[PDB]
Ligand binder design. Structure first.
Ligand SMILES: NC(=O)c1ccc[n+]([C@@H]2O[C@H](COP(=O)([O-])OP(=O)(O)OC[C@H]3O[C@@H](n4cnc5c(N)ncnc54)[C@H](OP(=O)(O)O)[C@@H]3O)[C@@H](O)[C@H]2O)c1
Ligand SMILES: NC(=O)c1ccc[n+]([C@@H]2O[C@H](COP(=O)([O-])OP(=O)(O)OC[C@H]3O[C@@H](n4cnc5c(N)ncnc54)[C@H](OP(=O)(O)O)[C@@H]3O)[C@@H](O)[C@H]2O)c1
Ligand SMILES: [Zn+2]
Ligand SMILES: [Zn+2]
Ligand SMILES: [Zn+2]
Ligand SMILES: [Zn+2]
Lengths: 359, 359
């Protein structure tokens, strides 16, 4: 059983089948090694990936499954060789917890692109055991995967930056869309979406938000500072913005029309897919061929950059607009997420609400 | 009527409806302007795009339509402002005959990416008249769009370089796949494919040919010099070559699986689509996200690069493997092309067989 698998006892909420239903779950985590760092989970943002996983949208999920990879907390214990963190420090873990550490991806600081990269949850760790997420009391990871929380960065509103944040930030840099004056487009004003707008503006880019929810317009223009708002379903409106974007970050979590998006790209424009629909997308070759445009994909970021991201976010006072919930509210939160009903990001107040849920 | 439109009488073969039936057609062309170069058509390769066009695969097609954009002939006349071609010179005309000549892509020798770019056939010229291609007797184009054939370049075997040639050459240079060490892949050993292989080998690159016709394995390996042949519909075969290509030039003229191509690509590898399928292709986001891979589009090339491409081919003894046909064989050749039954390139011998078809 999972309660006997490791020495130190653990508690959290897990799904047992593709119904995605979460409920108290008893498990355990490995003992704290020389390079590991142990910390009490204070907060953990709810990412749409946690939803896809528990519902088995990709048919990769193995149960029981404990989601959560936007973890934030307080260090309690650390191994003898730990160097950058002490007990009492505020730290966080993202979507990565390990890799092979020897290929060229790792050496170049891209543990996220290692063929043996280990995901924070629903993956197989170096010891062959199933990895469990941040929807739990405590966490333990190698110092290399431990992010340091700047002192002026709130523990709850900065949590989603660990995944949603690093994920949109990374592509804006790598594809040269973090240049002032440039015109960037963010498809889907959701978790990753609204964070992107914030980094894009922070870089000094004129920003266009492409959404299916006209009731987010005002918030997009007036709170996130987007310079333009487009309802992807209104062709007259879309067509007007034809060839105005140097690049686009697509965070859409479901299959959706790509043609219209290309139509918004200037010549040689770039479409960066970051969202993960359960099914294949429709790509019209002439959309690429006409203009020599490209469609690229990006997944989170390596550990190094993830750190550069939170530091940057803390300097510019960038944070996720969140809604703090109780552990026992997880099921309702998940349906609300599936139904586009969260004003950007749910974050679980694990510290003050997890314990009370044990039978 | 097309024969009254202009002052100089022309003759060729056109399609009148989407059945694609080609037959004699009487039209005309504008008079030789100050910067124009007039020439007698001697040859005209047959590109699959001609077939798509005449069957209206892309819905754009308009009739009557005269295909042909791999035109080679002898200059019969030149305006007073022509600088590099004299009467009697061997010239070529590719997919372009015009453009705005007053924007960034044109100013950067990318007439092909100009929004007002003009296609050799089925497009509207600067004088607002429809353009008819190379399946005709004579031809006339502004000096800018005239390719000067190199002395050591056969007119018939070099005709397809004017389109098939530049289309695979451009991406090879633009996406950095033009150098030894790079392991390149070419999908679809057809008109553009076999030529794509030659340029590739010429650049010193190692090459992998992905085909659906096992009976081409030898011509590819022994004659083109491919370092490896793969049968797309062979799991075990394809599987083995996973993650071994720095980039791929996809020339397929129809819908086909993409997942297998991303499978062959290395981390950060590039898939370059040059084939113009009729329907969109399936694109699983994970394939790109998994290893930050790219899917780019590319169409022919700029005038400057086209001239360079053929000068490169000449120095490297590169020509298309063709099959010369009489004009009256057009409909049979069109049926054979559609059935992937041409050992690389049908080339109309216009200079010796058109006139004999004029009623
Ligand atoms: N590759 C990576 O590294 C990585 C990292 C994190 C997350 N992801 C993936 O990114 C996606 C988004 O996660 P979130 O950002 O966590 O999700 P979310 O908050 O649910 O936001 C998704 C946003 O997209 C739009 N959307 C939803 N359904 C849509 C539909 N049928 N058609 C068009 N637009 C739709 C909505 O925006 P509008 O109201 O503006 O339309 C929705 O606000 C998920 O697939 C997740 O798995 C990938
Ligand atoms: N974007 C541009 O600038 C540009 C320029 C010129 C042409 N094109 C387009 O490029 C394509 C190829 O033109 P060609 O090179 O002129 O055509 P082609 O000679 O017909 O060659 C196409 C080659 O692809 C493969 N093929 C055909 N049907 C297939 C299918 N259902 N599944 C998998 N492979 C298939 C065959 O190769 P195997 O026997 O090896 O499978 C065929 O030899 C056309 O769509 C054309 O319109 C684009
Ligand atoms: Zn996530
Ligand atoms: Zn590695
Ligand atoms: Zn062509
Ligand atoms: Zn132009």
């Amino acid at each position: 059983s999972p309660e006997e698998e490791h020495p130190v006892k653990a508690f959290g909420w897990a799904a047992r089948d593709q119904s995605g239903h979460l409920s108290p779950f008893n498990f355990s985590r490995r003992a704290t090694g020389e390079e590991d760092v142990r910390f009490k989970v204070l907060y953990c943002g709810v990412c749409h990936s946690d939803l896809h996983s528990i519902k088995n949208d990709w048919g990769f999920s193995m149960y029981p499954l404990v989601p959560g990879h936007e973890i934030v907390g307080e260090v309690t214990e650390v191994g003898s060789k730990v160097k950058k963190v002490n007990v009492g420090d505020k730290v966080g873990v993202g979507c990565l917890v390990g890799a092979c550490h020897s290929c060229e991806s790792c050496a170049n600081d891209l543990e996220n692109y290692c063929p043996k990269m280990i995901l924070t949850y629903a993956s197989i760790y170096h010891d062959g055991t199933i990895t469990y997420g941040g929807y739990s009391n405590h966490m333990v990871a190698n110092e290399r995967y431990i992010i340091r929380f700047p002192d002026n960065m709130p523990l709850d509103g900065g949590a989603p930056l660990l995944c949603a944040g690093i994920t949109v930030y990374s592509p804006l840099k790598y594809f040269g869309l973090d240049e002032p004056g440039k015109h960037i487009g963010i498809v889907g004003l959701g978790g990753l979406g609204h964070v992107a707008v914030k980094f894009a503006k922070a870089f000094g880019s004129k920003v266009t938000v492409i959404s299916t929810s006209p009731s987010k317009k005002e918030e997009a223009l007036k709170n996130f500072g987007a310079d333009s708002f487009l309802v992807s379903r209104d062709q007259e409106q879309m067509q007007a913005a034809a060839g105005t974007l140097d690049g686009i970050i697509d965070t859409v979590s479901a299959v959706h029309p790509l043609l219209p998006l290309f139509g918004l790209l200037k010549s040689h424009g770039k479409l960066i897919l970051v969202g993960a629909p359960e099914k294949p997308l429709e790509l019209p070759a002439f959309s690429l061929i006409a203009g020599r445009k490209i469609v690229a994909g990006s997944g989170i970021g390596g550990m190094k950059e993830t750190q550069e991201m939170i530091d940057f976010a803390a300097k510019h006072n960038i944070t996720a607009d969140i809604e703090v919930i109780s552990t026992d509210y997880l099921n309702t939160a998940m349906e609300r997420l599936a139904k586009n009903d969260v004003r950007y990001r749910f974050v679980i107040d694990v510290g003050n609400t997890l314990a009370a849920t044990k039978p």
